[PDB]
């Protein structure tokens, strides 16, 4: 790195940003998983919208009461 | 461009945010980060008032009015055409005033002077926020704030005052009015005294502060001094605005009746409440 | 940070008797006591006060005006000290009824005393104006205070003397009393339509708000540059220093234009004078030329209909 | 005369309001004209006159006759500042800061600026000197509040750089103006009172640190102070707020600097 | 049109770019609010009527 | 040869060229948005 | 700083965290302002709740139609 | 588009990044307010 | 409570911080679902 | 080659590249959120 | 008309161009708002009526 | 020959020529817009 | 009429030209607004009536 304008910050704040970064690695991975799951559910919901399920429509398989 | 003496003061530094990103001038105006923000907000607010003029149907500047949402909307949003433009203009005005105060801080600070001026502007900002934000939120609806019109916010003043009868009987109101009148009196006296000292009888020598003290001690018998008069001016103005904000924050919130009914308590005090004669009884 | 709002340590010594040009010191009294309470804010010295011919005239007339109103208040309470204590703000010395018109034939008890007190007040106020002029003249100063006071007197005269004569009735002057004169104000507004739609009323309010604005601005500026000796203004006019420059540059960088140590006081005096000047004009036009200001505003592009 | 019109809706209300608009325009012009007596004509950043002078022309000059035989000041007039300014422009275009070339406080530029006033003390009404130490004044004594004489003086870095010897008071005005603060160099410096926080045990100076107390411009004569040197002292003490910001032990400043 | 570039020997780029950014954002907000104000082109209300949300 | 900002001819041309590239990119995005809106709902 | 376990990351990611940090300084300040404003409004709303405004209640000052 | 990078030989990164963070947060708060204002897309309902 | 710091002589900070970030995000998403499930405190109704 | 800031060509390219990586990450998160909202409830 | 160019020996280009830009934008906004105010030439409403948007 | 702003004759002519080129470009775009509006809906 | 040019030895060109520009623009706006106010010569409404756009 030739920028040499960020290197002037004190070592304590370097540590600070290091661990802010550790936590955003961890839970950015977790967020990617959760929101990819929602996008998958959304794809299936759209496919369900475009199909004529919504006109001829099945009875309940199980009682639930 | 520059005053004869301005250049030795145009130095870097003394700014809260943004280093020297906006640490430059445009003509005489110092810009800064908060100058950029305040120009944005002021421009947007004036534009939205013009768009209100278009929607309402008048181009008469004295008839343009931007009304707040009606009472049924409560503290929620309203359509732009019937109350939302008022909300956006209010946000723009609040942002512009606050950015103006912070820009003043930056300038006071580049020049090495105290922060009395952004202090005193904050009092006016808080009075405006009392009228527009604190009281209507405490009181349930945006419809209790005033419209943005030259002659239609006077209608708001009149209606709000007469909801409680003669508003003259609000006591914090009386204190604020006395402060305002005293402030105008002090301003006239101060300007006159300094001008008369600097511009004496015509062709004779310029006067001294001793002459000012002598004149005013001859007049009434107690001169306050230059530092005293400037302190008294700042404090009179700030007290007036503070008591205005108080008299309006308590109105319709802890007092709901005629204000002479408030004054009624002194009359009913135990050791004269029953005597016949006089105005009362 | 020290804010310069209150002195943090005080000093005192010999009293200052004041300058001595063209002033008859036989009339100047002796210096009074020093007040430690007043010293935390400004000067602590009281006196000496000048007592001249106009001083005695004004003192006599004002004392008799105040005494006349007080004696009427005592009569109006039935001579009961407790009733006087409890109804001090409700008593009123009310002018003659409309049917007397401008005549001085009103009996003592519906407005003869009002006329007597008004005569005393007239003499007191005009004597005080003359005294302001002469106190300025004795020290070789300008007469700016006299003319600002003349603006205030113009509003006072319109309220109590000129407008009643134009309307042909003493019943339309202001009663002497706290709540009574407040009700006079409210009822004047009610009778003539909104005074809010009187354009000169609006101008008067604009200049009162401008007085509060300008004088907060100026007090704050002078207290902010008092670290460079900014409060010593006559000398900054005489010999410009860095306080004057920093104040000018603050206001120039803030709003694009500034003033001088001298010129801000021209702004101040005119801002304060215009209040009562436009107020007197508005009250004089009120009822004499327009008797329903809201309709006038409708006719002049001010009100929606 | 209620309600007759000369033409249209024009009556005495309208005549009065339009007359006032004209009078207000004239008065605004006059007020600005009076306020164009210091600092004009306008100039480029390189000292040459600008193409701008403004919609408002300069007024005719007027003369103040100074008291005590000091002469006459006539304004507007030719204004130079009779001192060199140690600044170098940052950009070629206009409206940009001029950075100090050497030490900023001490060449006297920026918040540390000063003005070449008359190197004479300002006088009271009777001709004597206006500002004066307590010992030189007859009858004056500290009258209320915490007497600062004899207290140590602490700078902005939480060192004590000297301690208070005397108070300079303003005779007619009856108020303290300077702290004579003496160092263990042995020479004395002047401290504006509005820059010092007098506490119970200690006189705090937020503006300066110990190492900058020695640099304060000293006084020519030891019982009097002239206007020039008052600017000089006040400008340095005040410019200490920005130019001694690094050396300062402020919790909030260190807070923000560590974050920044 | 070819030598319009000489405008940059007249104007300092920094100030011009700050002003231009402020102007462009303000203009975009202007136009979006104007569209939102009219019952048509208020895309939010249009979608609300299309899908019967209110 | 006229100079106020102190930039030279080559600097001016370089800065103006990169500006204009940005300007035409902005314009292209605006045209795409305008066509999308026009197709979605015309105003003429 | 004695930790010496964060210093092993490459300079490019040090730059990365430096500017992530710059942006969270800026808009953490902005978030503090916005949410303090909401808390002020909430305080005034609570004071309005506890007072008997909600029983005796003022008419509209301005027409708005 | 390729050489937009030289914007950073014009602007100091620190100041630009502070301004950009402030701008982005303010814009997000703005839009969440426009959505909150309309009866639909006001999610804070119920 | 004073010497809880010695936990870091037991656990490597990197691993702990990754795990803690994952845990906190998952817990927040969980609670959002709990609020979303009840007819009140469900903001996605509108 | 103006260098008001003081940066060179390589420094400029490095800073701009890391900026743009951050910008596209922000944009990707925004697109995911926008698609989620659009699927949940369209505005067109 | 040939020597109008000497106006630039009277006026500084920077100030004139700033003032001209401000003036032109304000005039354009003026005229657009005037057109939007009238029931005709309010192009938005015109297109709303033409396509039966309401 | 006044020299209020400092420019010479050749500088004045060059600046005025580039100004007028910009002015006529602006005018041409305005005329095209005006003709488009007039054809779309006349005001005379 | 021949020596009217000596007015420029009385008045500074810069101030006069600024004042003249302001005056001319204000007068033009005056007259256009006066024309727009009257039901006739309000060219907008007139074109609306002639082409029957209402
Ligand atoms: C040609 C074509 C025709 C055109 C026609 C149209 C003209 C358009 C003009 C546009 C306006 C231009 C600018 C005007 C403001 C100029 C101010 C100025 O120049 O200051 C210089 C000058 C500075 O003095 P200085 O240099 O500091 O003194 C140094 C000396 O060593 C020491 O000197 P000194 O200590 O001896 O001070 C002496 C001097 C200096 O005064 C001061 O020190 C400043 C004080 C400011 C407060 C003054 C206001 C006091 C109000 C008095 C009563 C008010 C009620 C009047 C009734 C209301 C009207 C119906 O005192 C005065 O001048 C004030 C006298 C007030 C008497 C008012 C009598 C009733 C009105 C009669 C009109 C004529 C008035 C006098 C005119 C000649 C003056 C020489 O101050 C003045 O002269 C004050 C000017 C007063 C103007 C008139 C005041 C009232 C105005 C009424 C407005 C009504 C509008 C219409 C509405 C209703 C209509 C139906
Ligand atoms: C319902 C009531 C009406 C109304 C009715 C009136 C009437 C009626 C009048 C005013 C007037 C004024 N009103 Mg209004 N007013 C209303 C609403 C407002 C509002 C508001 C926000 O609602 C405001 C800010 C104002 C403000 C003002 C002032 C601008 C103005 C008075 C100037 C002044 O200082 O007089 C105070 C100063 C004086 C009276 C001068 C006194 C001078 C003399 C010399 C003093 C002598 C002192 C004596 C000797 C005592 C000595 C004491 C000892 C020495 C201790 N009004 C509504 C619409 N108002 C006046 C005016 O000018 O209107 C155009 C006026 O007459
Ligand atoms: C003791 C307290 C007093 C006091 C104090 C001080 N006051 C100050 C200062 C101090 C100390 C300053 O330092 C500051 C300043 O620099 O002055 C030159 C300021 C200022 N005092 C203004 C007006 C003013 N002071 C009033 C009152 C008092 N002030 C009280 C009494 C009143 C009324 C009605 O009473 C008014 C109108 C402006 C001139 C100026 C702000 C400009 C601004 O913020 O620009 C930024 C805003 C704009 C340029 C325009 C914004 C337009 C919005 C978006 C659309 C708004 C429409 C509107 C909501 C409705 C219309 C109906
Ligand atoms: C510009 C417009 C402002 C202004 C102006 C000015 N006002 C001045 C001066 C100027 C310039 C003076 O030079 C003069 C003076 O000397 O000041 C120290 C004066 C005064 N303004 C007084 C009162 C007052 N001003 C008010 C308003 C404004 N004034 C407006 C805002 C109000 C109200 C109701 O608002 C009130 C009550 C007295 C203190 C005093 C006259 C004493 C008198 O006449 O005594 C004569 C009367 C007595 C001696 C009776 C005493 C009764 C017994 C003894 C107790
Ligand atoms: C005494 C009366 C004052 C009270 C106020 C009266 C009301 C009129 C407003 C004037 C306020 C005081 C300023 C007077 C002088 C100002 C000045 O000198 O400008 C020069 C300065 C020029 O700076 P400069 O003066 O330093 O330039 C130096 C060169 N000379 C001196 C030669 C000019 O102008 C400015 O930079 C700032 C502008 C001041 C005016 C701002 C007022 C804003 C009001 C907005 C109202 C819009 C109407 C809205 C209506 C409804 C919608 C359409
Ligand atoms: C109701 C109105 C009451 C009267 C108001 C009088 C002032 C009106 C506003 C004038 C502000 C600017 C004046 C100086 C100036 O423009 O100089 C620029 C330029 C450059 O001037 P300059 O700044 O280089 O100064 C020349 C030298 N001195 C200072 C000595 C005079 O002027 C010109 O070259 C030609 C001027 C053309 C006419 C004015 C242009 C528009 C000015 C109005 C503001 C912007 C347009 C707004 C349109 C929308 C409606 C508001
Ligand atoms: C109410 O009125 C309504 C709203 C109805 C109608 C309103 C009408 C108004 C009049 C509309 C006004 C429109 C204006 C006039 C449009 C102007 C558009 C142009 C001028 C804006 C310019 C855009 C170009 C921008 C995007 C530039 C981008 C370039 C950056 C990406 C980097 C380039 C910056 C420098 C040169 C790069 C680095 C320099 C090097 C060489 C060191
Ligand atoms: C009222 O009008 C409304 C609101 C209705 C419509 C108006 C809308 C307005 C007009 C829209 C305006 C939009 C503006 C123009 C959008 C601008 C967006 C900006 C450009 C987004 C830029 C984002 C830049 C990103 C955040 C840059 C990030 C740089 C990084 C922080 C540097 C290091 C990169 C790291 C941290 C990320 C990847 C590496 C690791 C270690 C994860
Ligand atoms: C209510 O009233 C209504 C609205 C109904 C009617 C209103 C009527 C009013 C009176 C309309 C007023 C119209 C005004 C008078 C029209 C003025 C038009 C002209 C004066 C505007 C000028 C436009 C020219 C601009 C676009 C210049 C563009 C040139 C730039 C692209 C670069 C050129 C700048 C310099 C010279 C280039 C670099 C120089 C180098 C060589 C150093
Ligand atoms: C409501 O009341 C109504 C309206 C019904 C009735 C109103 C009646 C009122 C009273 C009417 C009042 C009318 C006034 C009194 C008329 C005055 C007319 C005269 C005095 C005006 C003068 C006009 C002359 C102007 C046009 C001068 C033009 C000369 C310039 C072209 C250049 C000459 C200037 C200098 C000398 C040239 C250069 C000099 C060199 C040698 C240095
Ligand atoms: C125990 O305490 C004692 C009894 C010893 C004394 C205490 C007295 C207290 C109670 C005094 C109370 C005084 C009241 C409260 C003062 C209130 C004054 C009110 C507020 C004045 C307000 C407005 C009055 C102004 C407008 C009057 C203006 C009238 C002037 C224009 C002069 C009028 C000119 C007259 C009519 C000319 C008549 C000429 C002769 C021939 C009659
Ligand atoms: Fe003053």
Numbering used by the authors:
A (entry chain c), G (entry chain C): 5 to 69
B (entry chain L): 1 to 281
C (entry chain M): 2 to 306
D (entry chain H): 1 to 260
E (entry chain 9), K (entry chain A), M (entry chain D): 1 to 54
F (entry chain 0), J (entry chain 8), L (entry chain B): 6 to 49
H (entry chain 7), I (entry chain 6): 1 to 46
Give sentences copied directly from the paper behind this entry:
Genetic deletion of the pufY gene had no notable effect on the oligomerization states of the RC–LH1 complexes, suggesting that PufY, which is not involved in monomer–monomer interactions, is not essential for dimerization of RC–LH1.
The reaction center (RC) and light-harvesting complex 1 (LH1) form a RC–LH1 core supercomplex that is vital for the primary reactions of photosynthesis in purple phototrophic bacteria. The RC–LH1 supercomplex comprises an RC surrounded by the LH1 ring that is made of multiple αβ-heterodimers. LH1 collects photons directly from sunlight or from the peripheral antenna, light-harvesting complex 2 (LH2), and transfers excitation energy to the RC. In contrast, some Rhodobacter species, such as Rba. sphaeroides, possess dimeric RC–LH1 core structures, representing the largest photosynthetic complex in anoxygenic phototrophs.
